[model samples]
Target: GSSGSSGPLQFHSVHGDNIRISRDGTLARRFESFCRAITFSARPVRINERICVKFAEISNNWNGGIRFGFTSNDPVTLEGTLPKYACPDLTNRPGFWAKALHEQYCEKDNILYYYVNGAGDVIYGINNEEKGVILTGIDTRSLLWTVIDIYGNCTGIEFLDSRIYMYQ
Candidate 1:
């Protein structure tokens, strides 16, 4: 995750060396401590722009499982449940096979969500199964694309050596 800012409300904790951040900046917890007190900054984890998360690599499941995504406050303070205010266990986030990337964009109305398997068609629709404000971006048709480096090419096709995948 080649990204950062005035700091997203991230979790930095002390563990038995078995816990640390992944290449994509996600977390992996591997210890059963009785309790962990995680402090919260005045600022929360903020996402002002569209963020695309592509996991460098991950095991489907190992030593049990992995917990990913955000919760209302801190897991230290709340019981892990599907309350309206909390989001994903994002479990099974990435497939155990190839590289996968998910695009996140908060709509004007303010929403958060994820999507996939559209077959190359740009898609935007109702909440699939996550939470309020469902919005997501995924590779449906298994498409791959490149940006137009030649911005001002009169004949767009001629300058288009790279394919572009569309998103809704």
Candidate 2:
């Protein structure tokens, strides 16, 4: 009945200093500065695993919203200074594909669901319904960890565990 070994997801410890993680590693928040609040999943996520998150807090003072996508590189291997925005800053590089989510779906207490399909399409949704594939051509040749940039209006977020549907 199980699909591979789906497990709980948490933000990686090796994240931007501006970003803070809760004791359980499921919660993450940006304390200061406007950028450099990037975080990655603790482990490589399985394909079709619905990674869910809650917008615990948000601020309209900033310009953009959350930017998220899949990365084949490991957090431990990340070198140099952490960039601010995932788009252009990180997405411009190989192995990292991310997009800035529309503010309409990134409000306080809102739940966001996203996953990578077998064809390498990065799909996302709000509340519960699938919206659309925001990014395409994700390299699935290697492991991919979920990356999120707590930049812009998003102040804090909580990782709510990943799940997989069994029924067709």
The prediction achieving the highest TM-score against the true structure is 2
lDDT (tens digit, per residue) of candidate 2 on 1-168: 112334677777767768777744467887777767888887788877778888888888877677888887788776345665566767878777887787678789988778888899988988777888898878666777888888777888888864532233
The Cα local distance difference test for each model comes to: 0.23, 0.76
Instruction: Report the lDDT tens digits of candidate 1 across residue range 13-53.
Output: 32222233332433322232222211111222222212222
Error (Å) of candidate 2 at residue 50 is 1.4
List candidate 1 segments past 4 Å from native: 1-11, 14-17, 22-43, 46-51, 60-69, 75-168
Model 2 residue 25 lDDT score = 44
lDDT of candidate 1? 0.23
Candidate 2 positional error at 94, Å: 1.6
Candidate 2 lDDT (Cα, whole model)?
0.76
lDDT of 1 at 63: 25
